Amino acid sequence: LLQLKLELPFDRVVTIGTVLVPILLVTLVFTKNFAEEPIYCYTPHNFTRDQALYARGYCWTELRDALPGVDASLWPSLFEHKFLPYALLAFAAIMYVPALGWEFLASTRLTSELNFLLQEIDNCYHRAAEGRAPKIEKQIQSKGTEREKREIIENAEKEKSPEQNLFEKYLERRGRSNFLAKLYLARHVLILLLSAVPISYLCTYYATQKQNEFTCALGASPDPAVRVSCKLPSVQLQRIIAGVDIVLLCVMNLIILVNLIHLFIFRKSNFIFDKLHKVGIKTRRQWRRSQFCDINILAMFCNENRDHIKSLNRLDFITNESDLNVVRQLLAALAQ
Amino acid sequence: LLQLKLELPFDRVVTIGTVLVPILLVTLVFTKNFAEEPIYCYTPHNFTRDQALYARGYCWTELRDALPGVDASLWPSLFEHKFLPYALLAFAAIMYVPALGWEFLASTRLTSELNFLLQEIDNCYHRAAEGRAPKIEKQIQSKGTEREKREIIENAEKEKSPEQNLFEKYLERRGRSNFLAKLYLARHVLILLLSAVPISYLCTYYATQKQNEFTCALGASPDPAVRVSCKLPSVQLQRIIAGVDIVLLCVMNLIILVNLIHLFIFRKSNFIFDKLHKVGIKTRRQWRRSQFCDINILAMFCNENRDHIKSLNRLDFITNESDLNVVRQLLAALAQ
Amino acid sequence: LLQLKLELPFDRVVTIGTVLVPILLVTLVFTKNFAEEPIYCYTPHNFTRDQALYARGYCWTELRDALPGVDASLWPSLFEHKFLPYALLAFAAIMYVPALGWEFLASTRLTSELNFLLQEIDNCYHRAAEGRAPKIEKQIQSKGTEREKREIIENAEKEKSPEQNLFEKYLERRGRSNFLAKLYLARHVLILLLSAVPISYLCTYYATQKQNEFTCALGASPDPAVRVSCKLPSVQLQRIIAGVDIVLLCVMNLIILVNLIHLFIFRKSNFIFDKLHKVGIKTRRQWRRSQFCDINILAMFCNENRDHIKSLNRLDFITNESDLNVVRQLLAALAQ
Amino acid sequence: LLQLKLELPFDRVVTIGTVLVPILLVTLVFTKNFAEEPIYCYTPHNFTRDQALYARGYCWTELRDALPGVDASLWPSLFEHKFLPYALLAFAAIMYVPALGWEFLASTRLTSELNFLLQEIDNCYHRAAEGRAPKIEKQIQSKGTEREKREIIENAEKEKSPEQNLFEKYLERRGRSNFLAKLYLARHVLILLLSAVPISYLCTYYATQKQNEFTCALGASPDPAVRVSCKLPSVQLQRIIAGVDIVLLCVMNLIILVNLIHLFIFRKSNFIFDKLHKVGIKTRRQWRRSQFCDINILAMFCNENRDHIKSLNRLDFITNESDLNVVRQLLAALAQ
Amino acid sequence: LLQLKLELPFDRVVTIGTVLVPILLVTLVFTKNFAEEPIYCYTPHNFTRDQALYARGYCWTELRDALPGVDASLWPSLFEHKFLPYALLAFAAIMYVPALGWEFLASTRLTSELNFLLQEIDNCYHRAAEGRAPKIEKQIQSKGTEREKREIIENAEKEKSPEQNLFEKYLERRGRSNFLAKLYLARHVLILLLSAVPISYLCTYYATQKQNEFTCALGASPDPAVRVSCKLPSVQLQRIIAGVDIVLLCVMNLIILVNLIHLFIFRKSNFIFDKLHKVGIKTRRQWRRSQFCDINILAMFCNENRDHIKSLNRLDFITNESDLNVVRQLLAALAQ
Amino acid sequence: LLQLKLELPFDRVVTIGTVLVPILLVTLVFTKNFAEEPIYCYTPHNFTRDQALYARGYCWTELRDALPGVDASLWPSLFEHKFLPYALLAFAAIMYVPALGWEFLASTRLTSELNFLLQEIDNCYHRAAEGRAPKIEKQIQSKGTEREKREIIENAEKEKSPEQNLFEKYLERRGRSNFLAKLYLARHVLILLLSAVPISYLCTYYATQKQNEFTCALGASPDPAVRVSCKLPSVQLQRIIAGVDIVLLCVMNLIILVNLIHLFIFRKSNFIFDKLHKVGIKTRRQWRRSQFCDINILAMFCNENRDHIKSLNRLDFITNESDLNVVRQLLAALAQ
């Protein structure tokens, strides 16, 4: 069985909104184009049924307008309409280097450091019935105010208990090694820069390629040049999925930006040492100086895994329901 | 094994009736249109078999009527008939934001708070054979009316028993935090508003797009303009699934409305604290002031899970069969 | 269950970057060519619909230009355009001899020598609670500086302990048998040489095969020779995937080169005896003379397997957090 | 679970190099031929579109040149070009009698005699901690040179120990019954002779069938004979996979030859009694007279299975690291 | 798990050689015929493109030559060429009654009588360490030639031991009930007779149906009879798989014959009571009178299962290695 | 695991012989007809290529001969040839009511009464080592002819033993309730009557529908009636699978008849109380009066399950080998 997942809901949403519907919007064009004649041309009268097939298969691989008067070098081309069944397929696979920079680069160290937290660090507040319940509040009832609780509670974590080498040493080591925040940031700030020529390419295409009717010109008749006006069927649908992707990809560059700015400059609630700060383990103000620690990133992964761990669920029901007396009934409930 | 499901029958019915038969009613149109010629046109006599293909493939990508006398700008268009193979496919995928606002936003906290109720809170009335059976009614038989039962029964839950920190504290905490009701309501009131332009779009289409016969006009003959009257095959079937969806989607904006109004203004039977109110745990009148608590929502999820939990099945057989003496034989049955 | 994998991320990246998208870029050409007419020719007027099929199916299996004036031996050929649907398929299968030189040649000895390390050598620093904890620092606390720790710590590994025949003998045996480094190097230096005629073939093709219009010539009319100018559709797309592969394969010959040079001449951090050099087992300077030992290669495989081994994860949390006192609390934590 | 495999890497390489790429090189021809017109013929002018179909489907089932002047009996045929889509398919299935001479003839006796070695003969040198460790070197330490070790070590295997009826009796029985070597040799020397008419058939085809243009002749017009020159499309590709197979099958007749000659005349290291000859069980020179024993074949199968047997892996780490003192620390390590 | 198989290698070879490649040689004809025009006819000049389709689809369902001069009753037919795509399919399913006469008639009794031998009769020579080892040779060592071993060994099986009701009673019962030999013989002697009209049918077809060119005649022109010479494409390939099957089926009637004759008249080594005749259980000469017992058939099934039974594998290693002293070390090896 | 099967081999043979090859003989006709032109007609000369398509698609949906002279009401029809692609498909599904009268009507009671026999009634003659072995023959050896064995053996089953309420009460209850024989007979006598109009339909079709050439007549020319003689391709193959089914279904009405008559009037060996009649449980002559009991039907189901029940296999080896002293060695073998 497995309970630890390395993907946030934000990452899944980004993946399904910038890599997936790309692909699902491309097969429509492929199935529309392959189910129709590539081009329609107005062949002259005295053209046999096989002599007019050359005129229809020759102006499709050429795609060159023939403006009267001008030379043969200033003829505008139309290769873009033919070329981007695939240009939409080369942009849905480029958006994988950021996605593959996690499953192949940091898919072992992070889960190695997290499975330890899963299996080892679980004795807090689920084994406290015999660990600390008959210790702190057992002597408080049998005495005799409000200026003595701190004195007794101080000699719980500060004392070099056997269950202390696994706590406050991780905080001291990972409280300055900002390595994970130097890679998860590169996971999102890179996808914000890769989504640039995606947008910059099919933005001038939407504004400079509109026409779908050109006068193709053949030559070298077998014994005079003949000109036929042709027509391109699938131009009206190509630039309907060529500017829906514009807003679909330009709106994913805003939610990522706001997420990244609010995580690194506004939000200061880890839940990895804030939820467990009132219940006995108080952290000295050595973290407020910088929010770039890896513990902030580990906090999200810990938050995403709260269900399959039964001890943490017991803690959630037994800790946060009285957040602000409470210890009066705890001693009478666990006095076994 | 799994026994807790997070989907109500109402949600499943809504999903299969507003997202599914949408899709199953679209493939019919796709398979009907792709199995026939897109358009039929009445070409003139002196037209070769390849010169008349341009006239049949050019008036299908144009779709513009040619009324006599008027200019070239006041010609009505017919792109709607061509366009909504897909407009019916863009409305069956829009109906997922309300559906994906539950599996990705509140698919962890709710089941985290419910699996605790599944595993932890089960000692009530299945362990009562040794928990309360030799306590309350054991002394009632050996005495000596109707003005003393309450006095004895009061010192069962009011007393700070060891099995009391898990009860009446959840009621006190979740009795004012109306968070779940602020999201489940947003899951249904949003699908009632998303189903608006679905209906407002293909309602004017049913009333303004009727004709299927237009006189297309070509031009620029290779050496006079020629006009051909054409015909659209699949117009009589498109607007048969374009107004069956009207009633199919306008009838799901009424059952959701009546469900939401009757849950929030009429129904006041939780079954999460009403069924268990006569059997010993009596709740003070602190809930009647508001029906917006999360416990009301948890009541539906608890109701949907009554079978795979054998203890609750024992309770159902052993509690509700004598709802209104009864305790006379209970002491004689469990006196082991 | 299995936890040891014999493939590095570098090998997987190389395989998916030089063997895979090769294949994925070939099916596009096959599906493009098979969905169009192979060639278009300008047949004369007095040609029946079956007499012009010979002219279209005869200049496609010939593919020979007919320059006027010259003889029948100096006619340039065009077989390259027809021939390399498949020449791109014979280069995606040649890149398997290096890939199959590992799964069939050294896929048993390496994992045989590694499963021993997995199952056998695990008692270090996870069984040390009863193995060395009450031995070294137990007597240090109960005495009486900085010139005596080495004297006590010397008689731990130097002494012929029962758990010593499995250590420092592997180092002595594999410290001079440079066999694995004589094969893993041949695994990569061979793929750097196999990727030569791949590049040298479709490099002159990109520079000497440009034209796609030739004047084919028939003969032996059934009672004069007739010449028809033909046209090749799929030439403009063939040399778009014939020079994207150039850079796609010429860029994989640089990362492999830098990896191989920096492994064998710049990196001197094994992590197989460097991480475990401060924590008690100190290695004499018998390795610094050569970096060609098999232990360097085994170090990478050990690094790739750090998660599923729980003892090594415990070591990682309990060893490297205080790398540079520390032993003061270790005795008080494991004094059971 | 299964750990014993009956196929050597050499056999797998031979199978995938002489039976498989045969097959993958045939489907290409089938998909190329079936995707094109079988033949192209130059029909005369006054031929209707259905009268010229007989001329195109009649010269394809005839395939007979018509040289002028000669009679109707000296006309060369061209049936080979039509015939060997399938002649390449009848040679990829003939190469199975040697392959099916092992899975049906000796796929039970060999693995029956090998599972005994797997399960029963495993007590050597893994149970020696209590079997021979306190026996041989336990008395060597407690005495008092180099002329007494043999005397003590002699009375270990020579003595009729309880674990002796399973050793040196197999050597005596299988040391003269050369049955397996009379069948494995027939498994390879037969595939060297079956790969003869494969090569001898499509070697004269590569040298005598070159032309692909013949003048077919019809007759019996319905009221004079008419001759039409035809053309065969797929002749230039058929003899490209008709001489790549020549070298592909003529190079597999050399590696098999060198393997067979070096196994039977040069290599004399079994590893089935050579590796285990220094560690206590010394074999008398009764094997050097002939290398045709079945133990030589069993040696390869034992070598291919060294990983899933953990006892043999322990032996490999604990035996060969000191091959050439060593026993000085073995007594101190296993003195439990 | 299952270890007993009811199919001999001979039966599998027969099934794959007379039922399988039949089928694999039929799909080739079906895919060849369905990928070509059924017939080619030389229609006259003044025939429209739809009037000549009747002449091509009418002489294919008629298949009747028209010899000049003779009447309309002496016209040879050609229905055999059309009829035996399927006549080759009705002979590959007839060869199943002998194959289905075993899985439905004797697929329960045989394996019922064999699973008993598998599970019950296994105590011989694997439990002999405590069953007979301290009994026969234990007293031979402690005495005091060659005229006394038989006297002691006689009172081992002749005596009415507890493990005797399961031995020599099966021999007495099944030593005269020749029922299985009356059915397995019918399983092979029937397939030798069913494969007769298979051969007798397509033997006259190979000798009397050669021509593939007939002059079909139409009639009743809508206002004179017109004759057209037609041609059959697939006649030269039909009789290439119509005489390869001749030898393929006539060679399977010889190996079966030699197997059956040598089993019933030459071979007299059961291995079911011959291998176990020297090791203590000696059978009286009551079997040499007839080799038609069912024990001979059970011997083959026992031989095919010698691997998954580890006790019999131990016996095979420990019994046949000294077949012709030997008992001298057996007592010293099993004296526990 | 499951060992009890409710289908006899006779039922499986019937199902595969009257329901299966029906279906397998229908797809051949469907694939033959759909791969050819439905009809061929001899259109006149002055008919355009689209005016002759009406004549070919109009005489196929009419199928009415036009005899000269007679009126328009006495024209014979030919709808049968078109109609029985499907009439052969409506007869392969009718043969399921007898097949579905067992899996839905008596697929619970029978296996309910048989699983009891499987699990409960197994103590006979496998537990007899301690149940009856030291009881009957233990006192016979220690005494002192042939006129006393019956006296001792009588007080074994006649006595009201604890293992007697499960025996001879089933015989008394099911010895007169002939319910199962009233349904299994209806399962076969119904399939003998359902296979009637199957045969009676395609028997007159084989004798009255022979011709496949009719002169169709059109009319109402757009400004005289025109008659065209047409031809039906697939008539010669339809009545080849229309009279092979005749004998294939008329031969299944004989084996069922002989089976039913011999079961109910000739065979009088149940094996459910005949095999177990000599070994101690003797049945009084209360069954010979009628063979219509359900125990006779249960006997076949018991016979089909003799393998997976190991106790019954032990009984088969230990009971029937001495059917006709025998008890002399049984006491000495089981005297534990």
PDB file of C-alpha atoms in Angstrom, chain B residues 130-184:
ATOM      1  CA  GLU B 130     -20.219  -4.112  29.284  1.00  0.00           C
ATOM      2  CA  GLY B 131     -20.174  -0.309  28.996  1.00  0.00           C
ATOM      3  CA  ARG B 132     -23.622   0.726  30.225  1.00  0.00           C
ATOM      4  CA  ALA B 133     -25.845  -2.379  30.452  1.00  0.00           C
ATOM      5  CA  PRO B 134     -24.756  -3.362  34.015  1.00  0.00           C
ATOM      6  CA  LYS B 135     -24.835   0.319  35.015  1.00  0.00           C
ATOM      7  CA  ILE B 136     -28.177   2.031  34.347  1.00  0.00           C
ATOM      8  CA  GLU B 137     -30.894  -0.639  34.433  1.00  0.00           C
ATOM      9  CA  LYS B 138     -29.002  -3.104  36.650  1.00  0.00           C
ATOM     10  CA  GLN B 139     -29.940  -1.085  39.750  1.00  0.00           C
ATOM     11  CA  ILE B 140     -33.440  -0.173  38.526  1.00  0.00           C
ATOM     12  CA  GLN B 141     -34.699  -3.755  38.848  1.00  0.00           C
ATOM     13  CA  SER B 142     -33.318  -4.137  42.396  1.00  0.00           C
ATOM     14  CA  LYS B 143     -35.072  -1.320  44.239  1.00  0.00           C
ATOM     15  CA  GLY B 144     -38.126  -0.791  46.410  1.00  0.00           C
ATOM     16  CA  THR B 145     -42.166   4.807  39.592  1.00  0.00           C
ATOM     17  CA  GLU B 146     -41.746   7.387  36.825  1.00  0.00           C
ATOM     18  CA  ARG B 147     -40.010  10.362  38.517  1.00  0.00           C
ATOM     19  CA  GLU B 148     -36.575   8.803  39.097  1.00  0.00           C
ATOM     20  CA  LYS B 149     -35.316   7.427  35.756  1.00  0.00           C
ATOM     21  CA  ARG B 150     -34.033  10.831  34.621  1.00  0.00           C
ATOM     22  CA  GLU B 151     -32.015  11.304  37.820  1.00  0.00           C
ATOM     23  CA  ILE B 152     -30.100   8.055  37.286  1.00  0.00           C
ATOM     24  CA  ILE B 153     -29.758   8.497  33.517  1.00  0.00           C
ATOM     25  CA  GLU B 154     -28.357  12.028  33.912  1.00  0.00           C
ATOM     26  CA  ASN B 155     -25.046  10.800  35.367  1.00  0.00           C
ATOM     27  CA  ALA B 156     -24.085   8.876  32.219  1.00  0.00           C
ATOM     28  CA  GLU B 157     -23.006  11.445  29.604  1.00  0.00           C
ATOM     29  CA  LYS B 158     -22.917  14.596  31.753  1.00  0.00           C
ATOM     30  CA  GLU B 159     -20.291  12.946  33.961  1.00  0.00           C
ATOM     31  CA  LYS B 160     -16.732  13.344  32.659  1.00  0.00           C
ATOM     32  CA  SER B 161     -16.395   9.721  31.613  1.00  0.00           C
ATOM     33  CA  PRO B 162     -13.249   8.457  29.853  1.00  0.00           C
ATOM     34  CA  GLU B 163     -15.366   8.066  26.694  1.00  0.00           C
ATOM     35  CA  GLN B 164     -16.480  11.701  26.752  1.00  0.00           C
ATOM     36  CA  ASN B 165     -13.635  13.752  25.227  1.00  0.00           C
ATOM     37  CA  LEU B 166     -14.744  12.438  21.810  1.00  0.00           C
ATOM     38  CA  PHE B 167     -18.391  13.503  22.264  1.00  0.00           C
ATOM     39  CA  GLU B 168     -20.091  16.907  22.640  1.00  0.00           C
ATOM     40  CA  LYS B 169     -16.752  18.509  21.782  1.00  0.00           C
ATOM     41  CA  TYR B 170     -17.217  17.820  18.073  1.00  0.00           C
ATOM     42  CA  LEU B 171     -20.715  19.284  18.413  1.00  0.00           C
ATOM     43  CA  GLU B 172     -19.298  22.381  20.120  1.00  0.00           C
ATOM     44  CA  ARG B 173     -16.565  22.885  17.508  1.00  0.00           C
ATOM     45  CA  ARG B 174     -18.525  22.116  14.319  1.00  0.00           C
ATOM     46  CA  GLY B 175     -21.727  23.694  15.645  1.00  0.00           C
ATOM     47  CA  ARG B 176     -20.629  27.131  14.430  1.00  0.00           C
ATOM     48  CA  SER B 177     -17.995  26.514  11.706  1.00  0.00           C
ATOM     49  CA  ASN B 178     -20.213  26.602   8.615  1.00  0.00           C
ATOM     50  CA  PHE B 179     -17.456  25.857   6.105  1.00  0.00           C
ATOM     51  CA  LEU B 180     -18.655  22.690   4.349  1.00  0.00           C
ATOM     52  CA  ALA B 181     -22.089  24.221   3.750  1.00  0.00           C
ATOM     53  CA  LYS B 182     -20.234  27.146   2.141  1.00  0.00           C
ATOM     54  CA  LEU B 183     -18.745  24.771  -0.470  1.00  0.00           C
ATOM     55  CA  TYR B 184     -21.336  22.060  -1.150  1.00  0.00           C
TER      56      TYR B 184
END
